[PDB]
Amino acid sequence: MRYEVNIVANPNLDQSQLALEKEIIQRALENYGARVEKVEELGLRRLAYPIAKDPQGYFLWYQVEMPEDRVNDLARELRIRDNVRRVMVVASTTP
Amino acid sequence: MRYEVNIVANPNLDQSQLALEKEIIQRALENYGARVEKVEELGLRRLAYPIAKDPQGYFLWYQVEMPEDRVNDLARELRIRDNVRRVMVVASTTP
C-alpha cells in the first residue's frame, strides 16, 4: 500500500541533531522493508488552525510503499524518540 | 503568508454533493481574498496511524497566499459545514 508519513520534529534542534533524526527515520523505513518513494524536508512550519500552545515544528514528509500489516510497528518505532513529536500516517487509498 | 489548507470532507458524499462542497471552498478562499496557488483533490484516504474510530475521509489540499490576520476567520468559515469534518492550516514559514 502507498502511505504518506508526516513527521513533526522538535523545532529547537540544531542541524547536527536534525541530521541524526533524519538518518534514523530513513534507516527505520528501510529496516521495516518500506520502499521510499519521496522525501520532502519541509522545515520549520507553524500550525495556524486549530490553535495549539506549541504550534511550531520541523516538518518532514515521506511517501512510501509497504505492507499494511507492518505500518503500525513502523510508526510506533518512529515516534519513540523524544525529538519526534508527532507521526501521522495516511493510506493513499481505501477499500 | 503562504499556507497549506488541509480539508477532510465526509467520505460518504456523492460527487454531486462533493462538487458543491468544492465550489463553496473555492468561493470562500476568493471571498476572503486568498490567492489560490494549487488545488489537489486527493480523494478517499484512510488514517492509518494514530487509530481513529472513523478513519476514512475525502481529502482536499490547497496552497494559498493570504494575510495572517484573515486566516482564522477563513478556517472557521470553511469548517462550519457539516460535510467538512476537519480543517487544518499550516503556515509554510515561521518567525
From Swiss-Prot, chains A, B:
InterPro entries noted in UniProt: Ribosomal_bS6 (IPR000529), Ribosomal_bS6_CS (IPR020815), Ribosomal_bS6_sf (IPR035980), Ribosomal_S6_plastid/chlpt (IPR020814), Transl_elong_EF1B/ribsomal_bS6 (IPR014717)
Taxonomic superkingdom: Bacteria
Protein name, as recorded: Small ribosomal subunit protein bS6
UniProt subunit comment: Part of the 30S ribosomal subunit. Forms a tight heterodimer with protein bS18. May make transient contacts with protein uL2 of the 50S subunit during translation.
Keywords of this entry: Ribonucleoprotein, Ribosomal protein, RNA-binding, rRNA-binding
Entry keyword RNA-binding: yes
Pfam families assigned: Ribosomal_S6 (PF01250)
Any GO molecular function: structural constituent of ribosome
GO cellular component terms attached to this protein's record: cytoplasm; ribonucleoprotein complex; ribosome
UniProt xrefs under PANTHER family: MITOCHONDRIAL 28S RIBOSOMAL PROTEIN S6 (PTHR21011), SMALL RIBOSOMAL SUBUNIT PROTEIN BS6M (PTHR21011:SF1)
Keyword Lipoprotein among UniProt keywords: no
Gene behind this protein: rpsF
Family: Belongs to the bacterial ribosomal protein bS6 family.
Function: Located on the outer edge of the platform on the body of the 30S subunit.
GO biological process, one term: translation
Protein's organism: Thermus thermophilus (strain ATCC 27634 / DSM 579 / HB8)
